[PDB]
Every structure is written in structure tokens, then in C-alpha cells.
């Protein structure tokens, strides 16, 4: 159990000494010294000691093997973006097993000066979360307000996690703008996979990041159907990334081992077990209440007017914290672990927990509409939407209907006003009425930014009564598909031919078509190729040749840039086997 060494095998000029380690020891750069009774103590070398989820008696221990191989030994991950209605994967490279990651991580850790509390993963995780959130608040620059499309090909391309770590510690590379501030979780996961703590990166769509401790969110909307002014203390983001780490909690009461969410606060961080979020125990850790408020809280909507008087409006209820997803194990598909965060809505158990948490917090329409909109909208294209209206009154009524479309960043920040339309209708005889209207991109007023999502709002004002009905939907923008053709198995030290196909679905000819291939263990760094003009009717088809070198499971990525769009990424996996003897 304690530090030990046995001399197992003996030769006249050699000894084979087997050093053994205790289960609870401080990690870091060690040094071995040999001291005979006579001579001065002699330096023998250096090594490093890390955590092992393979040992049974250590705290951070994983029983299943494939979970270990996916969560600890893997390097080629996925991060899910987009709206909850259509989820788009993006290939990402953690690269935790590079050369410099371990020494950089230990140098970041060593600014704590509390040495003996490094034997435990809780203290290390909390400290590293706090430091990485502080560094993100330090080195992230706001977006340039001026429009630079010619440099938009360089502002928003990401290569992995390690260049961002280097640029955050030393500041000798490209900065990361506010358009992509969600990298932080992945970075933290990188650090934990370096140190021995299993971790993964989850995405919560429609999360309530903002102020916490209150189960209600206010939103203000214009008479025309937009949002007057900018910002709010608590708003509903389109998505939000977070980090989960697997460990055991000895300091807590018994029954909380497993997954924990790492939560930094605006600096002291802390981590909370997921079962605490499901059961709802607020008083176990000061951070549980805000995280539980972050998942299931409801919003109310206010109507601003010309007089300045705010009005409540009756709208359809929207859900918060749905479609929790992450990378599946041993494959390249998504899996939802959302059953670990909430009960099914409308059960006795969820009603019980809601009533209990509300009791604990207590101590501290004649017409309506509804909207059908598609989940995805093509670039340089069009779609159809429909609004129905049902009245319940024997008398006829006049109504004014407004429709607004506008792009929004991923953190609720307004970007540009795009479209609005106002019309008058007369409903009669208590009959429903459906209005179908097209939406063409050519009818828009401005070009959308690089990473935005459109918010479509509809507001029906009754002419007689000032109480009005409201609905909103979110739509992500879809880009043309990028076909990769490549065989499943390849032989080592052999040529391999990949094919890439692209169809110009867009109405404009592409110019300055520049594509690039890269991949870890397949091609050395990065390759670039140029092309001719691609007309809107025709397609493009290209072919590349390389040769795999490292046996096992790899994947390659392709990336396309042009004048219409930038950073269109895709990936494909391959299994390479050792050659036959």
C-alpha cells in the first residue's frame, strides 16, 4: 500500500527494481534519489505520476472498459451546435496527448501554493475551473463592429483546443472573438483528460443562463414584432456548453458518486453532482439552486407600447432545457443523456419536486393563434410558413397581424433587423382561418452574419381589446451538403484515394473556391487546393491521394471556403490495420 520497491531479477552487472506506488499521492514532476550509507545522494532521473481510472482502490475509478477507452484515450471528438430542432455536429480535436500539454497544465496548476491538497481530484478540478474561467474573461476580445467579409474566412475557423490553450497562456497566436466563446468547456475537458480525470462535453439547448434564484424570465417586444432595446439580465440562450467529470464524493453524504457538472461562478468554482440536480436538493451546495433554475424555468412576455406602459400578452408556452445531448461511446453518433437531468414532464414525481422547491422558495381569450414553421431553411432559398387563427365569439372581429424576422447571435444578442410585415384581417362566425405565406431570402433587407440564427415572431393584436396573442420560433440556417467517398478499410503504407463531391445548390456562382484537408495521424499538417468557378447548375468533383501511417482508427476532415460562405466542415472515419506478415 505504501511506497515500496522489490529487487526481482538479479544479474552480475544489473538489477531490475520494481517501484510501486500508493493509491493517494500528489501528482506532478517527481525526482528519484538513491542514498547509500556512504556516498552523497544521487539523482537517478525524473518522471510524472498521474491518476488511473483502472485501479479499483483509487477514487476516480471507472468500472467499464469501453467507457474508459472513449472518455480517456480518445482524441477525436464532436461538439453539437445548432437549434434543438436540427442538430449539426462539428468535428473537434482535443489533442490531449500532445507533447506540451502536461507541462503547461502543471505550470498553470502550480500557482496555488496549497501543495498537500493536490492529492485529491476535487481540489484540482475546482481550481482549474476557476483559473480557466478567469483566463477566458481575460484574453477574449469582443467582435469588430465594422464588417470585414474578406477576413471572415480567418476570424471564425477553429483548428482544435491546443492552439487556443497556447494563445491564452502566452498570447502569441490568433485571438478568439466573442462569436465563439463556447470553446471554454472543451478546453477544460482537454485539461482534465491530460491530468487523468475522465470528462466529456455536453450541450444544453435553450438554457436559462443569466440571473438565477428566480423561476421567471421577462422579455420585451416591440409594437412591430421586434425587441426594443438590447439585452436583459436573464435571457434564453440558443445553446450553452458545459463540462461533466466523473469522480466520487467522499466529503458529501453517501450516495452521490458519478457524474458531476463543473460550474464556475462570477472567482470561485465548484462542482455539483447531477443527482442533486435531479432530486432538487438546494441546500447541499450553494450552486445547486442556480443550476436547477437554469434547466426548468418558465418565461413571460411583455408588450411595450408608444405610451411606455408595458402589457402582458397571452402566448404559447415554450420549453426550457430540452434535448440534452452528447457524444456516444464507441461510435460516431449522438446520444441523449437527458433522462439524467429531468423527470418526464407531467409525472407525479416532477410535480412533487416542483411543489417542494416552490414551497422552499416561498420562505425566501376569445381568439388565439398558432404557428407552423420549418425546422431548417436553405441558404439563398425560401420556405413557407403558416399561421392559424381561431376565434371564440359570436360577433365578428377585426385583427392586426404582424410578422417579424431577425437574426440573433448564440447568446441572445440581437444582430440585425431583417423583415417585418403587417396586415389586417376580419374573422367571422367563429371559424378558424389559416394564412400561408412564403419567406424568400431575396426579399430580405440585409445579409446575415457568419454565425446567427433567425427568430421568427408573430403578434396578433385584437382591434377591440388590447390583450394580444404572440408566438415565436427559432430556425437554423442549413448549408449545402458535402459528400465524402472513401473506402472503409485501408492497408498501412499504401496509397489511399479519397473523393470529394459538392453540388452548387445556391443561385450564385462560387468563386475563389479553396478547400483544405487535414487529419491527425493521416496527413502531416494541412493541405490546400484551388478550383475554378462553380456555376449554380453544375457541381464539382475532386480526388486526393495520401497514405496512412499509424495503425488503428483515424478520421479525416475536409473544409471548404468560397465567397458565399466559409468554414464548411465535414469528416469521415476509417480503420487501418497492420500489414500481413
Amino acid at each position: 500500500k505504501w511506497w515500496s520497491a522489490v529487487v526481482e531479477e538479479r544479474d552480475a552487472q544489473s538489477w531490475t527494481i520494481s517501484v510501486t506506488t500508493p493509491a493517494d499521492a500528489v501528482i506532478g514532476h517527481y525526482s528519484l534519489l538513491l542514498q547509500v550509507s556512504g556516498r552523497k545522494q544521487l539523482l537517478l532521473g525524473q518522471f510524472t505520476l498521474l491518476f488511473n481510472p483502472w485501479n479499483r482502490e483509487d477514487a476516480v475509478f471507472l468500472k467499464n472498459e469501453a467507457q474508459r477507452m472513449e472518455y480517456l484515450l480518445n482524441q477525436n471528438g464532436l461538439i453539437y451546435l445548432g437549434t434543438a430542432d436540427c442538430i449539426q455536429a462539428e468535428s473537434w480535436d482535443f489533442g490531449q496527448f500532445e507533447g506540451d500539454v502536461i507541462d503547461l497544465s502543471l505550470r498553470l496548476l502550480s500557482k496555488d501554493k496549497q501543495v498537500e491538497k493536490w492529492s485529491q481530484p476535487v481540489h484540482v478540478a475546482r481550481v482549474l475551473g476557476a483559473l480557466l474561467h478567469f483566463l477566458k474573461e481575460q484574453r477574449v476580445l469582443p467582435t469588430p463592429q465594422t464588417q470585414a467579409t474578406q477576413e471572415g474566412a480567418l476570424l471564425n475557423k477553429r483548428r482544435g483546443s491546443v492552439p487556443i490553450l497556447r494563445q491564452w497562456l502566452t498570447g502569441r497566436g490568433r485571438p478568439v472573438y466573442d462569436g465563439q466563446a463556447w470553446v471554454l468547456a472543451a478546453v477544460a475537458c482537454t485539461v482534465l483528460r491530460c491530468l487523468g480525470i475522465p470528462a466529456r462535453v455536453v450541450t444544453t439547448f435553450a438554457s436559462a443562463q443569466g440571473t438565477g434564484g428566480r423561476l421567471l424570465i421577462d422579455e420585451y417586444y416591440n409594437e412591430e414584432g421586434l425587441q426594443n432595446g438590447e439585452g436583459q439580465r436573464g435571457r434564453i440562450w440558443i445553446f450553452q456548453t458545459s463540462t461533466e467529470c466523473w469522480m466520487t464524493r467522499p466529503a458529501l453524504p453517501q450516495g452521490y458518486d458519478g457524474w458531476q457538472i463543473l460550474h464556475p461562478s462570477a472567482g470561485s468554482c465548484d462542482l455539483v453532482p447531477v443527482r442533486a440536480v435531479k432530486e432538487g436538493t438546494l441546500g447541499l451546495t450553494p450552486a445547486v439552486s442556480d443550476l436547477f433554475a437554469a434547466i426548468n424555468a418558465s418565461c413571460v412576455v411583455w408588450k411595450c407600447c408608444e405610451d411606455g406602459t408595458l402589457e402582458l400578452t397571452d402566448s404559447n408556452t415554450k420549453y426550457v432545457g430540452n434535448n440534452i445531448s452528447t457524444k456516444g461511446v464507441g461510435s460516431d453518433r449522438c446520444e441523449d443523456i437527458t433522462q439524467n437531468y429531468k423527470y418526464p414532464e407531467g409525472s407525479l414525481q416532477e410535480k412533487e419536486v416542483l411543489e417542494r422547491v416552490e414551497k422552499e422558495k416561498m420562505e425566501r381569450s376569445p381568439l388565439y393563434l398558432l404557428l407552423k414553421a420549418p425546422s431548417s431553411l436553405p441558404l439563398r432559398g425560401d420556405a413557407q410558413i403558416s399561421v392559424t387563427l381561431v376565434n371564440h365569439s359570436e360577433q365578428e372581429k377585426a385583427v392586426q397581424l404582424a410578422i417579424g424576422v431577425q437574426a440573433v447571435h448564440y447568446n441572445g444578442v440581437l444582430a440585425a433587423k431583417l423583415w417585418r410585415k403587417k396586415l389586417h384581417l376580419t374573422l367571422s362566425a367563429n371559424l378558424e382561418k389559416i394564412i400561408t405565406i412564403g419567406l424568400f431570402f431575396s426579399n430580405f433587407e440585409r445579409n446575415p452574419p457568419e454565425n446567427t440564427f433567425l427568430r421568427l415572431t408573430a403578434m396578433a393584436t385584437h382591434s377591440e381589446s388590447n390583450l394580444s396573442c404572440f408566438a415565436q420560433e427559432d430556425i437554423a440556417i442549413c448549408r449545402p451538403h458535402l459528400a465524402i467517398k472513401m473506402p472503409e478499410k485501408a492497408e498501412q503504407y499504401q496509397p489511399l484515394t479519397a473523393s470529394v463531391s459538392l453540388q452548387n445548390s445556391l443561385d450564385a456562382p462560387m468563386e475563389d473556391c479553396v478547400i483544405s484537408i487535414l487529419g491527425r495521424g493521416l496527413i502531416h499538417r494541412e493541405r490546400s487546393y484551388r478550383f475554378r468557378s462553380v456555376w449554380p447548375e453544375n457541381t464539382m468533383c475532386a480526388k486526393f491521394q495520401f497514405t496512412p501511417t499509424h495503425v488503428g482508427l483515424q478520421r479525416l476532415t475536409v473544409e471548404v471556403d468560397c465567397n458565399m460562405f466559409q468554414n464548411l466542415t465535414n469528416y469521415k472515419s476509417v480503420t487501418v490495420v497492420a500489414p500481413e506478415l
Binding site: 487546393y529 484551388r530 480526388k543 497514405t547
Partner: protein
């Protein structure tokens, strides 16, 4: 025909590959080898010619090393070295463990910058993977002579 594209160099993404780890200081030991062919069978092979531990020490035809001495060059050597290094190909921080992978990546990088024609890749890959003898085998070989490669491989 499937139309193959042309190359294009852009250094916008180079700074994402600059490591920060200090490599340190290390001494060097240089070994030079060149293509030859032995007399008993018309088989090309790489043979060492000199070493640079402290001074240049050359290997004679009898197989015995001579005296160390200072290193003097010729002007054409330095001129052609500057000319060919001005348009040379570099590969920094390659992640390999065997010579075949280094050869394949170097050949692919050669093809990328249009140094050689694609139909010559097979011949160079066959050339760079022959066996590398040492000083002990020369008297077993009976002597070696310069051997330039040919397209047919003879």
C-alpha cells in the same frame, strides 16, 4: 476525367502549430550515406562514407577509417547548397517512428510543391527502402561501385 486541382500556399494557419516546449541543447553525430552497388550482384545499396564526431573521418576503399582532419569544402558545393535550400522542402515536428512513414510523408510533400512528377513516386519509394549495410559487411561484399537509378530499376 476527374480534374485534379493545383497547389496553393497560405500561411494564415501556420501559427497554430508553433510549439512552446523548450527542446534544449544536445550534441550531434553526423553520418553520410550514398547510393552504390556491389560487384558480385548488380544490387544498389546505401553506403556510409564519413563521420563527423569531432573532425571529418572518411572511409577508404579497403574499409578502414583514416585520420581525423579539418573540414574544407568547394565553392560549387556551397553555391548549389544555397540554391537548392532556397527552394527546398522542410518538414518540422514530424510524428513518426519508422523510416517508411517518413519516406511516405516526404514524398507526398514533394508531390505537393511540384518538385517531382507523380509517376516517379513509385521509383523513389522503392529506392528509399533498401537495406542499409554497415562497416562490418564490406569485406563480405567484395567491394561496391556507384550505381545511379533507372526508370526500369535496372
Amino acid at each position: 476525367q476527374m480534374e485534379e486541382p493545383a497547389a496553393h500556399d497560405t500561411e494564415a494557419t501556420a501559427t497554430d502549430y508553433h510549439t512552446t516546449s523548450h527542446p534544449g541543447t544536445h550534441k550531434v553525430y553526423v553520418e553520410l550515406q550514398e547510393l552504390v552497388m556491389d560487384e558480385k550482384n548488380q544490387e544498389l545499396r546505401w553506403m556510409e562514407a564519413a563521420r563527423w564526431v569531432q573532425l571529418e573521418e572518411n572511409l577508404g576503399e579497403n574499409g578502414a577509417w583514416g585520420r581525423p582532419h579539418l573540414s574544407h569544402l568547394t565553392f560549387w558545393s556551397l553555391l548549389e547548397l544555397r540554391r537548392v535550400f532556397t527552394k527546398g522542402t522542410v518538414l518540422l515536428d514530424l510524428q513518426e517512428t519508422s523510416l517508411a512513414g517518413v519516406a511516405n510523408q516526404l514524398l507526398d510533400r514533394f508531390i505537393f510543391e511540384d518538385q517531382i512528377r507523380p509517376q516517379d513516386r513509385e521509383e523513389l519509394l522503392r529506392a528509399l527502402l533498401l537495406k542499409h549495410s554497415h562497416a562490418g559487411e564490406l569485406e563480405a561484399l567484395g567491394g561496391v561501385k556507384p550505381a545511379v537509378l533507372t526508370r526500369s530499376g535496372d
